[PDB]
Amino acid sequence: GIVLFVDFDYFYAQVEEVLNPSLKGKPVVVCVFSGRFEDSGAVATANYEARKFGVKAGIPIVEAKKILPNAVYLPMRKEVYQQVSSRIMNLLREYSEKIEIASIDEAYLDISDKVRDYREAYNLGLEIKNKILEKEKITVTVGISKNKVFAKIAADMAKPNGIKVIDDEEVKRLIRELDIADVPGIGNITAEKLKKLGINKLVDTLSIEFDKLKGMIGEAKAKYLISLARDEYNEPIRTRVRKSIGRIVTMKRNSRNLEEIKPYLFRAIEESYYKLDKRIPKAIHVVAVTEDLDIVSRGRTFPHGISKETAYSESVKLLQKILEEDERKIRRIGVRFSKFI
DNA sequence: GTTGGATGGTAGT
DNA sequence: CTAACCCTACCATCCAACC
Ligand SMILES: Nc1nc2c(ncn2[C@H]2C[C@H](O)[C@@H](COP(=O)(O)OP(=O)(O)OP(=O)(O)O)O2)c(=O)[nH]1
Ligand SMILES: [Ca+2]
Ligand SMILES: [Ca+2]
Ligand SMILES: [Ca+2]
């Protein structure tokens, strides 16, 4: 079984360069403007020229403006990138209808049947990169392995505008040699628990007591890592299905005032309900980000679909429930829908 | 025991 | 207002209602 993974290069920023070809070769930074003050908010992403200077996805815009004053700062246009993204997903579809869209800019193809070996798979990767550059002038990075996880890694090892195979040989070695903190799914907190344990490599997990590992990182992660290690990982490529859709906004200033918070919450509901598109949710959750940025939420599942009217009425109740129970001012407010019929 | 709801932690993009 | 967006997946834990 062979799996090809495609992840587009500095996406949002690359789209901006294609739409505006003068930008290429200069620093470009795509920003989410929060509205709270001149340049309040965060960097969605930035091109490699910009990354050279410490400007990356996630930092605060005014810090980007600090460390790289003279770059090009562009406002995020999520719908433009999504149209490009849709056109590209359809290209990848030409190459295999067995596709798994994992986000705005990346996908896993199962190519077990288009190709007999890694060499052909490699050439298909080459055939892919070309088509996308032909049709959407977008460069991408391709990872090929026997499974999602190791394909992802191959891609990570090749960014930007690269293509890499990890063959059965490589897989065997990376199990023995690749730092554990580099396994997709193993973030900071986890990685820390694993070193206190003395597990630095995927292989280290084999020679430990399952119940001792579990009783540190959780069941799900423990099984997962051991599966990886035993080279028994075989999660198929499956058509992704949204489990929840929502929207959360940033207020002009922090409040506790229901009158002041309400138009933000309602804005979220409109956008959220519009993004649903013939989907009927049985569960609503109001989500609040506090002064000190701790995230907090109150929900309700009904036994039936929620109509836009129920959602309205319900989200106010729930926002009150937060305010009743947490006495910190609120900074961002939004809503989330789930359990679609 | 079962599942499944509320809330929150962790991870990733 | 003085930095920290935006969105979704999956999982753990704390309960409760129950086959
Ligand atoms: N608003 C916002 N958007 C983000 C954030 N992280 C990623 N994105 C968006 C912008 C990216 O172009 C798009 C794909 O992200 P990626 O993680 O794949 O990296 P990107 O393509 O930007 O650079 P690439 O070479 O992978 O590193 O997702 C974030 O923290 N906030
Ligand atoms: Ca990506
Ligand atoms: Ca990318
Ligand atoms: Ca990590």
mmCIF file of C-alpha atoms (C1' of nucleotides) and ligand atoms in Angstrom:
data_model
loop_
_atom_site.group_PDB
_atom_site.id
_atom_site.type_symbol
_atom_site.label_atom_id
_atom_site.label_comp_id
_atom_site.label_asym_id
_atom_site.label_seq_id
_atom_site.Cartn_x
_atom_site.Cartn_y
_atom_site.Cartn_z
ATOM 1 C CA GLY A 1 0.000 0.000 0.000
ATOM 2 C CA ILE A 2 1.432 3.354 -1.140
ATOM 3 C CA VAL A 3 0.273 6.808 0.037
ATOM 4 C CA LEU A 4 1.161 10.162 -1.539
ATOM 5 C CA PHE A 5 0.679 13.299 0.601
ATOM 6 C CA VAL A 6 0.482 16.815 -0.825
ATOM 7 C CA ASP A 7 0.866 19.983 1.216
ATOM 8 C CA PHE A 8 0.919 23.382 -0.586
ATOM 9 C CA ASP A 9 3.741 25.909 -0.049
ATOM 10 C CA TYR A 10 3.236 28.954 2.207
ATOM 11 C CA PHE A 11 -0.290 28.760 0.927
ATOM 12 C CA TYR A 12 -2.142 31.989 1.675
ATOM 13 C CA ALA A 13 0.976 33.986 0.856
ATOM 14 C CA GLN A 14 1.647 32.000 -2.319
ATOM 15 C CA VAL A 15 -1.874 32.682 -3.515
ATOM 16 C CA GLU A 16 -1.258 36.387 -3.001
ATOM 17 C CA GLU A 17 1.932 36.197 -5.098
ATOM 18 C CA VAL A 18 0.128 34.475 -7.965
ATOM 19 C CA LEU A 19 -2.676 37.064 -7.780
ATOM 20 C CA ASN A 20 0.003 39.764 -7.548
ATOM 21 C CA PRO A 21 3.237 38.668 -9.318
ATOM 22 C CA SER A 22 5.179 41.761 -8.274
ATOM 23 C CA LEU A 23 5.264 40.471 -4.659
ATOM 24 C CA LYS A 24 7.329 37.361 -5.393
ATOM 25 C CA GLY A 25 10.938 37.583 -4.138
ATOM 26 C CA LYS A 26 9.954 40.050 -1.427
ATOM 27 C CA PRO A 27 8.646 39.439 2.113
ATOM 28 C CA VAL A 28 4.880 38.843 2.191
ATOM 29 C CA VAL A 29 2.743 38.477 5.289
ATOM 30 C CA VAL A 30 -0.912 37.543 5.378
ATOM 31 C CA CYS A 31 -2.671 38.820 8.499
ATOM 32 C CA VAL A 32 -5.834 38.343 10.537
ATOM 33 C CA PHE A 33 -6.757 41.844 11.721
ATOM 34 C CA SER A 34 -8.666 41.616 15.007
ATOM 35 C CA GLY A 35 -9.962 45.208 14.988
ATOM 36 C CA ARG A 36 -9.098 46.024 18.625
ATOM 37 C CA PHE A 37 -6.447 48.578 17.570
ATOM 38 C CA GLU A 38 -4.147 49.643 14.744
ATOM 39 C CA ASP A 39 -2.869 46.184 13.659
ATOM 40 C CA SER A 40 -4.393 44.181 16.461
ATOM 41 C CA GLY A 41 -4.371 40.427 15.626
ATOM 42 C CA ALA A 42 -2.132 37.601 14.326
ATOM 43 C CA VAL A 43 -0.194 36.324 11.282
ATOM 44 C CA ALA A 44 -2.084 33.704 9.336
ATOM 45 C CA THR A 45 1.096 32.850 7.411
ATOM 46 C CA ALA A 46 4.043 34.425 5.579
ATOM 47 C CA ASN A 47 6.368 33.601 2.667
ATOM 48 C CA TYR A 48 9.836 32.160 3.089
ATOM 49 C CA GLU A 49 11.489 35.520 2.496
ATOM 50 C CA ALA A 50 9.600 36.746 5.589
ATOM 51 C CA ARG A 51 10.249 33.596 7.626
ATOM 52 C CA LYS A 52 13.957 34.316 7.391
ATOM 53 C CA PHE A 53 13.293 37.177 9.763
ATOM 54 C CA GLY A 54 11.318 35.373 12.456
ATOM 55 C CA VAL A 55 7.905 36.182 10.941
ATOM 56 C CA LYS A 56 5.749 33.009 11.042
ATOM 57 C CA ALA A 57 2.158 31.798 11.254
ATOM 58 C CA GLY A 58 0.845 32.722 14.724
ATOM 59 C CA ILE A 59 2.956 35.672 15.921
ATOM 60 C CA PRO A 60 1.244 39.009 16.671
ATOM 61 C CA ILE A 61 1.082 41.367 13.677
ATOM 62 C CA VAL A 62 2.699 44.262 15.592
ATOM 63 C CA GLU A 63 5.659 42.001 16.361
ATOM 64 C CA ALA A 64 5.910 41.087 12.717
ATOM 65 C CA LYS A 65 5.806 44.829 11.984
ATOM 66 C CA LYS A 66 8.471 45.205 14.673
ATOM 67 C CA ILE A 67 11.032 42.657 13.452
ATOM 68 C CA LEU A 68 10.219 43.164 9.762
ATOM 69 C CA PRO A 69 8.849 46.695 9.344
ATOM 70 C CA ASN A 70 9.040 46.969 5.565
ATOM 71 C CA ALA A 71 7.415 43.750 4.392
ATOM 72 C CA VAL A 72 4.058 43.581 2.543
ATOM 73 C CA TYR A 73 1.196 43.123 4.997
ATOM 74 C CA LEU A 74 -1.917 41.738 3.383
ATOM 75 C CA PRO A 75 -5.342 41.022 4.907
ATOM 76 C CA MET A 76 -6.507 37.436 4.997
ATOM 77 C CA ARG A 77 -8.989 36.514 2.252
ATOM 78 C CA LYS A 78 -10.061 32.978 3.266
ATOM 79 C CA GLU A 79 -12.554 32.575 0.365
ATOM 80 C CA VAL A 80 -9.966 33.391 -2.299
ATOM 81 C CA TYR A 81 -7.627 30.735 -0.952
ATOM 82 C CA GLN A 82 -10.509 28.275 -0.646
ATOM 83 C CA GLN A 83 -11.396 28.679 -4.311
ATOM 84 C CA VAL A 84 -7.784 27.997 -5.245
ATOM 85 C CA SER A 85 -7.776 25.132 -2.791
ATOM 86 C CA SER A 86 -10.927 23.658 -4.380
ATOM 87 C CA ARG A 87 -9.517 23.871 -7.832
ATOM 88 C CA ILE A 88 -6.404 22.027 -6.654
ATOM 89 C CA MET A 89 -8.207 19.258 -4.732
ATOM 90 C CA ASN A 90 -10.014 18.520 -7.998
ATOM 91 C CA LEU A 91 -6.692 18.188 -9.770
ATOM 92 C CA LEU A 92 -5.486 15.711 -7.207
ATOM 93 C CA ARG A 93 -8.824 13.944 -7.829
ATOM 94 C CA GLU A 94 -7.763 13.286 -11.442
ATOM 95 C CA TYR A 95 -4.923 11.217 -10.010
ATOM 96 C CA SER A 96 -6.960 9.292 -7.445
ATOM 97 C CA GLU A 97 -10.608 9.502 -6.385
ATOM 98 C CA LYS A 98 -9.411 7.729 -3.238
ATOM 99 C CA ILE A 99 -8.524 11.141 -1.644
ATOM 100 C CA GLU A 100 -8.561 12.494 1.966
ATOM 101 C CA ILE A 101 -8.648 16.295 2.311
ATOM 102 C CA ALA A 102 -7.065 17.038 5.698
ATOM 103 C CA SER A 103 -7.174 20.828 5.586
ATOM 104 C CA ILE A 104 -7.249 23.961 3.398
ATOM 105 C CA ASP A 105 -3.879 23.157 1.784
ATOM 106 C CA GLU A 106 -3.211 19.452 2.149
ATOM 107 C CA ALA A 107 -4.493 15.985 1.154
ATOM 108 C CA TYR A 108 -3.603 12.286 1.135
ATOM 109 C CA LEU A 109 -3.949 10.285 -2.066
ATOM 110 C CA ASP A 110 -3.973 6.545 -1.931
ATOM 111 C CA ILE A 111 -2.053 5.583 -5.031
ATOM 112 C CA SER A 112 -1.734 1.822 -4.444
ATOM 113 C CA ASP A 113 -3.415 1.206 -7.798
ATOM 114 C CA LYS A 114 -2.046 3.969 -10.070
ATOM 115 C CA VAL A 115 1.522 2.746 -9.526
ATOM 116 C CA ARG A 116 3.448 -0.468 -8.819
ATOM 117 C CA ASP A 117 6.353 0.934 -6.786
ATOM 118 C CA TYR A 118 7.975 3.899 -5.104
ATOM 119 C CA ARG A 119 9.844 4.855 -8.253
ATOM 120 C CA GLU A 120 6.600 5.240 -10.199
ATOM 121 C CA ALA A 121 5.012 6.941 -7.192
ATOM 122 C CA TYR A 122 7.916 9.337 -7.171
ATOM 123 C CA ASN A 123 7.378 10.055 -10.863
ATOM 124 C CA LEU A 124 3.656 10.613 -10.180
ATOM 125 C CA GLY A 125 4.643 13.072 -7.471
ATOM 126 C CA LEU A 126 6.673 14.797 -10.157
ATOM 127 C CA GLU A 127 3.722 14.576 -12.543
ATOM 128 C CA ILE A 128 1.521 16.083 -9.844
ATOM 129 C CA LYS A 129 3.737 19.068 -8.881
ATOM 130 C CA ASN A 130 3.914 20.003 -12.567
ATOM 131 C CA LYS A 131 0.189 19.973 -13.211
ATOM 132 C CA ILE A 132 -0.526 22.214 -10.262
ATOM 133 C CA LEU A 133 2.164 24.683 -11.325
ATOM 134 C CA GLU A 134 0.763 24.447 -14.865
ATOM 135 C CA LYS A 135 -2.822 25.079 -13.824
ATOM 136 C CA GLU A 136 -2.651 27.179 -10.648
ATOM 137 C CA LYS A 137 1.016 28.381 -10.611
ATOM 138 C CA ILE A 138 1.275 26.944 -7.070
ATOM 139 C CA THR A 139 4.262 25.007 -5.825
ATOM 140 C CA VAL A 140 3.655 22.126 -3.423
ATOM 141 C CA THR A 141 5.649 19.604 -1.402
ATOM 142 C CA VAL A 142 5.050 15.893 -1.855
ATOM 143 C CA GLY A 143 5.639 13.096 0.647
ATOM 144 C CA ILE A 144 5.416 9.463 -0.331
ATOM 145 C CA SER A 145 5.378 6.600 2.120
ATOM 146 C CA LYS A 146 3.468 3.427 2.975
ATOM 147 C CA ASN A 147 1.102 5.348 5.311
ATOM 148 C CA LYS A 148 -0.363 8.755 6.089
ATOM 149 C CA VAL A 149 1.892 9.347 9.096
ATOM 150 C CA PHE A 150 5.180 8.622 7.370
ATOM 151 C CA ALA A 151 4.066 10.461 4.208
ATOM 152 C CA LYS A 152 3.341 13.586 6.261
ATOM 153 C CA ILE A 153 6.846 13.256 7.734
ATOM 154 C CA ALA A 154 8.441 12.862 4.304
ATOM 155 C CA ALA A 155 6.703 16.082 3.285
ATOM 156 C CA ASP A 156 7.825 17.831 6.448
ATOM 157 C CA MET A 157 11.406 16.810 5.611
ATOM 158 C CA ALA A 158 11.108 18.366 2.153
ATOM 159 C CA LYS A 159 9.337 21.751 2.543
ATOM 160 C CA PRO A 160 9.240 23.922 0.523
ATOM 161 C CA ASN A 161 8.659 22.879 -3.090
ATOM 162 C CA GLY A 162 10.063 19.375 -2.496
ATOM 163 C CA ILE A 163 9.288 15.705 -2.988
ATOM 164 C CA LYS A 164 10.551 12.845 -0.832
ATOM 165 C CA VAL A 165 10.066 9.108 -0.557
ATOM 166 C CA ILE A 166 10.359 7.128 2.645
ATOM 167 C CA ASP A 167 10.653 3.516 1.573
ATOM 168 C CA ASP A 168 10.230 0.442 3.822
ATOM 169 C CA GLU A 169 13.978 0.794 4.550
ATOM 170 C CA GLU A 170 13.605 4.381 5.687
ATOM 171 C CA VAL A 171 10.544 3.602 7.833
ATOM 172 C CA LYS A 172 12.532 0.890 9.644
ATOM 173 C CA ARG A 173 15.389 3.367 10.349
ATOM 174 C CA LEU A 174 13.185 6.321 11.361
ATOM 175 C CA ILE A 175 11.453 4.126 13.902
ATOM 176 C CA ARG A 176 14.932 3.606 15.433
ATOM 177 C CA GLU A 177 16.346 7.103 14.938
ATOM 178 C CA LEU A 178 13.780 9.924 14.523
ATOM 179 C CA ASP A 179 13.182 11.989 17.658
ATOM 180 C CA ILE A 180 9.755 11.142 19.079
ATOM 181 C CA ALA A 181 8.787 14.820 19.391
ATOM 182 C CA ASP A 182 8.822 14.752 15.578
ATOM 183 C CA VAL A 183 5.930 12.286 15.260
ATOM 184 C CA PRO A 184 2.763 13.944 13.987
ATOM 185 C CA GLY A 185 0.413 13.928 16.970
ATOM 186 C CA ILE A 186 3.235 14.302 19.488
ATOM 187 C CA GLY A 187 3.153 17.945 20.477
ATOM 188 C CA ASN A 188 4.876 19.733 23.336
ATOM 189 C CA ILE A 189 3.080 18.501 26.457
ATOM 190 C CA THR A 190 3.289 14.861 25.376
ATOM 191 C CA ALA A 191 6.940 15.036 24.248
ATOM 192 C CA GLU A 192 7.770 16.277 27.762
ATOM 193 C CA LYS A 193 6.105 13.350 29.482
ATOM 194 C CA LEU A 194 7.970 10.985 27.164
ATOM 195 C CA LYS A 195 11.438 12.310 28.095
ATOM 196 C CA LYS A 196 10.760 12.131 31.846
ATOM 197 C CA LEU A 197 10.006 8.546 30.854
ATOM 198 C CA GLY A 198 13.143 8.246 28.716
ATOM 199 C CA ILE A 199 11.363 7.566 25.424
ATOM 200 C CA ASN A 200 13.114 9.632 22.751
ATOM 201 C CA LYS A 201 12.605 7.375 19.748
ATOM 202 C CA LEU A 202 9.583 5.561 18.340
ATOM 203 C CA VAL A 203 11.409 2.320 19.113
ATOM 204 C CA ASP A 204 11.677 3.097 22.870
ATOM 205 C CA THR A 205 7.940 2.519 23.168
ATOM 206 C CA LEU A 206 8.201 -1.189 22.379
ATOM 207 C CA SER A 207 10.326 -2.068 25.413
ATOM 208 C CA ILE A 208 7.995 -0.433 27.959
ATOM 209 C CA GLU A 209 4.984 -1.636 29.974
ATOM 210 C CA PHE A 210 1.780 -0.739 28.075
ATOM 211 C CA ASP A 211 -0.145 0.166 31.284
ATOM 212 C CA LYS A 212 2.768 2.372 32.411
ATOM 213 C CA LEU A 213 2.861 4.166 29.049
ATOM 214 C CA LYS A 214 -0.944 4.464 28.867
ATOM 215 C CA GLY A 215 -0.917 5.765 32.439
ATOM 216 C CA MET A 216 1.076 8.777 31.240
ATOM 217 C CA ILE A 217 0.064 9.769 27.695
ATOM 218 C CA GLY A 218 -3.402 8.194 27.501
ATOM 219 C CA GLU A 219 -4.696 5.053 25.847
ATOM 220 C CA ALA A 220 -5.228 6.513 22.356
ATOM 221 C CA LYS A 221 -1.695 7.859 22.018
ATOM 222 C CA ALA A 222 -0.094 4.770 23.507
ATOM 223 C CA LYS A 223 -1.826 2.329 21.102
ATOM 224 C CA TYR A 224 -1.084 4.744 18.224
ATOM 225 C CA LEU A 225 2.668 5.017 18.924
ATOM 226 C CA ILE A 226 3.044 1.253 19.480
ATOM 227 C CA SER A 227 1.227 0.632 16.192
ATOM 228 C CA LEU A 228 3.654 3.016 14.470
ATOM 229 C CA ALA A 229 6.648 1.371 16.149
ATOM 230 C CA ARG A 230 5.570 -2.190 15.230
ATOM 231 C CA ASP A 231 5.184 -0.874 11.675
ATOM 232 C CA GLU A 232 1.590 -2.069 11.795
ATOM 233 C CA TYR A 233 0.018 1.348 11.166
ATOM 234 C CA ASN A 234 -2.541 1.077 8.365
ATOM 235 C CA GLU A 235 -5.288 3.735 8.720
ATOM 236 C CA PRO A 236 -6.968 3.995 5.353
ATOM 237 C CA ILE A 237 -7.461 7.139 3.309
ATOM 238 C CA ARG A 238 -11.099 8.062 4.017
ATOM 239 C CA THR A 239 -13.228 10.925 2.680
ATOM 240 C CA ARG A 240 -13.141 13.513 5.461
ATOM 241 C CA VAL A 241 -16.528 14.582 6.938
ATOM 242 C CA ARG A 242 -16.913 17.757 8.982
ATOM 243 C CA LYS A 243 -17.885 16.971 12.541
ATOM 244 C CA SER A 244 -18.430 20.530 13.670
ATOM 245 C CA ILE A 245 -18.642 23.980 12.065
ATOM 246 C CA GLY A 246 -18.373 27.301 13.878
ATOM 247 C CA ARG A 247 -17.091 30.835 14.083
ATOM 248 C CA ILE A 248 -15.579 32.999 16.808
ATOM 249 C CA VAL A 249 -14.875 36.738 16.696
ATOM 250 C CA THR A 250 -12.768 39.271 18.602
ATOM 251 C CA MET A 251 -14.502 42.099 20.413
ATOM 252 C CA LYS A 252 -13.450 45.735 20.127
ATOM 253 C CA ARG A 253 -12.759 45.543 23.851
ATOM 254 C CA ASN A 254 -13.230 43.035 26.676
ATOM 255 C CA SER A 255 -16.716 42.881 28.194
ATOM 256 C CA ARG A 256 -19.031 41.216 30.678
ATOM 257 C CA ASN A 257 -21.960 43.183 29.342
ATOM 258 C CA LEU A 258 -24.545 41.039 27.603
ATOM 259 C CA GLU A 259 -25.794 44.044 25.610
ATOM 260 C CA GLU A 260 -22.279 44.671 24.361
ATOM 261 C CA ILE A 261 -21.363 41.006 23.695
ATOM 262 C CA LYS A 262 -24.607 40.080 21.917
ATOM 263 C CA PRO A 263 -24.004 41.535 18.423
ATOM 264 C CA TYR A 264 -20.677 39.678 18.249
ATOM 265 C CA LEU A 265 -22.294 36.412 19.283
ATOM 266 C CA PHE A 266 -25.098 36.905 16.787
ATOM 267 C CA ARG A 267 -22.655 37.683 14.007
ATOM 268 C CA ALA A 268 -21.051 34.285 14.723
ATOM 269 C CA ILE A 269 -24.404 32.541 14.492
ATOM 270 C CA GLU A 270 -25.162 34.076 11.084
ATOM 271 C CA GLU A 271 -21.826 33.144 9.588
ATOM 272 C CA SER A 272 -21.948 29.721 11.285
ATOM 273 C CA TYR A 273 -25.451 28.930 10.141
ATOM 274 C CA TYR A 274 -24.616 30.013 6.600
ATOM 275 C CA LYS A 275 -21.525 27.756 6.578
ATOM 276 C CA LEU A 276 -23.769 24.809 7.561
ATOM 277 C CA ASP A 277 -25.449 24.641 4.119
ATOM 278 C CA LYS A 278 -28.254 22.080 4.449
ATOM 279 C CA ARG A 279 -26.660 20.599 7.565
ATOM 280 C CA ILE A 280 -28.818 20.353 10.653
ATOM 281 C CA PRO A 281 -27.000 20.204 13.998
ATOM 282 C CA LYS A 282 -28.306 18.624 17.206
ATOM 283 C CA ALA A 283 -25.735 20.376 19.400
ATOM 284 C CA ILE A 284 -24.708 23.974 19.949
ATOM 285 C CA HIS A 285 -21.814 25.206 22.087
ATOM 286 C CA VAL A 286 -21.049 28.827 22.942
ATOM 287 C CA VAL A 287 -17.286 29.418 23.134
ATOM 288 C CA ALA A 288 -15.661 32.262 25.063
ATOM 289 C CA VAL A 289 -12.035 33.383 25.225
ATOM 290 C CA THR A 290 -11.325 35.203 28.481
ATOM 291 C CA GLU A 291 -9.126 38.143 29.445
ATOM 292 C CA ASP A 292 -6.113 35.920 30.073
ATOM 293 C CA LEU A 293 -6.983 33.869 27.035
ATOM 294 C CA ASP A 294 -8.220 30.712 28.783
ATOM 295 C CA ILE A 295 -10.885 29.136 26.546
ATOM 296 C CA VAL A 296 -14.267 28.312 28.143
ATOM 297 C CA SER A 297 -17.528 26.824 26.762
ATOM 298 C CA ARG A 298 -21.122 25.950 27.594
ATOM 299 C CA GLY A 299 -23.196 23.595 25.485
ATOM 300 C CA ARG A 300 -26.449 21.734 24.983
ATOM 301 C CA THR A 301 -27.384 18.736 22.817
ATOM 302 C CA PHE A 302 -31.052 18.498 21.840
ATOM 303 C CA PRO A 303 -32.763 15.371 20.600
ATOM 304 C CA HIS A 304 -33.565 17.235 17.384
ATOM 305 C CA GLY A 305 -32.137 19.560 14.772
ATOM 306 C CA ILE A 306 -31.551 23.132 15.927
ATOM 307 C CA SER A 307 -33.268 25.791 13.822
ATOM 308 C CA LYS A 308 -31.632 29.171 13.419
ATOM 309 C CA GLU A 309 -34.207 30.533 15.890
ATOM 310 C CA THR A 310 -33.479 27.968 18.573
ATOM 311 C CA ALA A 311 -29.721 28.628 18.169
ATOM 312 C CA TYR A 312 -30.299 32.346 18.709
ATOM 313 C CA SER A 313 -32.380 31.880 21.843
ATOM 314 C CA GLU A 314 -30.134 29.096 23.083
ATOM 315 C CA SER A 315 -26.812 30.844 22.636
ATOM 316 C CA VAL A 316 -27.940 33.804 24.754
ATOM 317 C CA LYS A 317 -28.991 31.468 27.578
ATOM 318 C CA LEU A 318 -25.587 29.789 27.270
ATOM 319 C CA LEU A 319 -23.646 33.048 27.195
ATOM 320 C CA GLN A 320 -25.452 33.991 30.395
ATOM 321 C CA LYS A 321 -24.515 30.559 31.795
ATOM 322 C CA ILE A 322 -20.821 31.417 31.223
ATOM 323 C CA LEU A 323 -21.166 34.894 32.739
ATOM 324 C CA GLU A 324 -23.025 33.404 35.749
ATOM 325 C CA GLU A 325 -20.218 30.926 36.337
ATOM 326 C CA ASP A 326 -17.024 32.614 35.180
ATOM 327 C CA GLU A 327 -16.473 36.203 36.334
ATOM 328 C CA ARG A 328 -13.571 37.146 34.020
ATOM 329 C CA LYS A 329 -14.247 39.669 31.251
ATOM 330 C CA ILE A 330 -14.652 38.172 27.783
ATOM 331 C CA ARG A 331 -12.316 38.906 24.852
ATOM 332 C CA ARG A 332 -13.416 36.669 21.931
ATOM 333 C CA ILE A 333 -16.914 35.233 21.624
ATOM 334 C CA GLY A 334 -18.245 32.638 19.154
ATOM 335 C CA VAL A 335 -20.435 29.570 18.677
ATOM 336 C CA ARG A 336 -19.899 26.005 17.494
ATOM 337 C CA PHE A 337 -22.343 23.511 15.963
ATOM 338 C CA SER A 338 -22.088 19.737 15.946
ATOM 339 C CA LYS A 339 -23.912 16.387 15.705
ATOM 340 C CA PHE A 340 -25.235 16.818 12.191
ATOM 341 C CA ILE A 341 -28.169 14.677 11.082
ATOM 342 C "C1'" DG B 1 -20.486 -2.922 33.210
ATOM 343 C "C1'" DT B 2 -22.820 0.510 28.439
ATOM 344 C "C1'" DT B 3 -23.017 4.802 26.048
ATOM 345 C "C1'" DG B 4 -23.128 9.484 25.588
ATOM 346 C "C1'" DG B 5 -23.184 14.442 27.357
ATOM 347 C "C1'" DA B 6 -20.544 18.504 29.316
ATOM 348 C "C1'" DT B 7 -16.351 20.593 29.550
ATOM 349 C "C1'" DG B 8 -11.561 21.001 28.759
ATOM 350 C "C1'" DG B 9 -6.671 19.492 27.048
ATOM 351 C "C1'" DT B 10 -3.772 18.745 23.232
ATOM 352 C "C1'" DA B 11 -2.531 19.073 18.500
ATOM 353 C "C1'" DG B 12 -2.349 20.557 14.290
ATOM 354 C "C1'" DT B 13 -2.955 24.069 10.437
ATOM 355 C "C1'" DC C 1 -6.387 49.642 22.940
ATOM 356 C "C1'" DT C 2 -1.236 48.676 23.960
ATOM 357 C "C1'" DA C 3 0.128 40.669 21.891
ATOM 358 C "C1'" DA C 4 -1.663 36.378 21.472
ATOM 359 C "C1'" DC C 5 -6.463 35.202 14.967
ATOM 360 C "C1'" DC C 6 -8.895 31.682 13.241
ATOM 361 C "C1'" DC C 7 -10.774 26.645 12.866
ATOM 362 C "C1'" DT C 8 -11.426 21.563 13.466
ATOM 363 C "C1'" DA C 9 -10.143 16.684 15.169
ATOM 364 C "C1'" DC C 10 -9.722 13.652 18.709
ATOM 365 C "C1'" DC C 11 -9.445 12.322 23.227
ATOM 366 C "C1'" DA C 12 -9.771 12.300 28.539
ATOM 367 C "C1'" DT C 13 -12.469 12.970 32.820
ATOM 368 C "C1'" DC C 14 -16.265 13.738 35.495
ATOM 369 C "C1'" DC C 15 -20.751 12.652 35.755
ATOM 370 C "C1'" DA C 16 -25.479 10.706 34.863
ATOM 371 C "C1'" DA C 17 -28.869 7.592 33.127
ATOM 372 C "C1'" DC C 18 -29.244 2.944 32.314
ATOM 373 C "C1'" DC C 19 -29.439 -2.074 29.897
HETATM 374 N N1 LIG D 1 -5.259 32.389 10.674
HETATM 375 C C1 LIG D 1 -4.364 31.391 10.694
HETATM 376 N N2 LIG D 1 -4.132 30.705 9.586
HETATM 377 C C2 LIG D 1 -3.192 29.736 9.686
HETATM 378 C C3 LIG D 1 -2.480 29.392 10.803
HETATM 379 N N3 LIG D 1 -1.610 28.346 10.518
HETATM 380 C C4 LIG D 1 -1.838 28.084 9.256
HETATM 381 N N4 LIG D 1 -2.780 28.889 8.687
HETATM 382 C C5 LIG D 1 -3.265 28.833 7.306
HETATM 383 C C6 LIG D 1 -2.369 29.709 6.441
HETATM 384 C C7 LIG D 1 -1.524 28.709 5.671
HETATM 385 O O1 LIG D 1 -1.146 29.218 4.388
HETATM 386 C C8 LIG D 1 -2.427 27.484 5.570
HETATM 387 C C9 LIG D 1 -1.629 26.208 5.470
HETATM 388 O O2 LIG D 1 -0.774 26.208 6.606
HETATM 389 P P1 LIG D 1 0.529 25.282 6.651
HETATM 390 O O3 LIG D 1 0.651 24.887 8.096
HETATM 391 O O4 LIG D 1 0.375 24.119 5.696
HETATM 392 O O5 LIG D 1 1.902 26.049 6.311
HETATM 393 P P2 LIG D 1 2.050 27.066 5.063
HETATM 394 O O6 LIG D 1 1.439 26.551 3.766
HETATM 395 O O7 LIG D 1 1.481 28.431 5.373
HETATM 396 O O8 LIG D 1 3.646 27.151 4.962
HETATM 397 P P3 LIG D 1 4.234 25.700 4.534
HETATM 398 O O9 LIG D 1 5.616 25.573 3.892
HETATM 399 O O10 LIG D 1 3.620 24.434 5.130
HETATM 400 O O11 LIG D 1 4.998 25.861 5.841
HETATM 401 O O12 LIG D 1 -3.169 27.489 6.796
HETATM 402 C C10 LIG D 1 -2.708 30.120 12.003
HETATM 403 O O13 LIG D 1 -2.140 29.974 13.096
HETATM 404 N N5 LIG D 1 -3.671 31.113 11.852
HETATM 405 CA CA CA D 2 -0.309 22.183 5.534
HETATM 406 CA CA CA D 3 1.597 24.233 3.706
HETATM 407 CA CA CA D 4 6.253 17.961 17.989
#
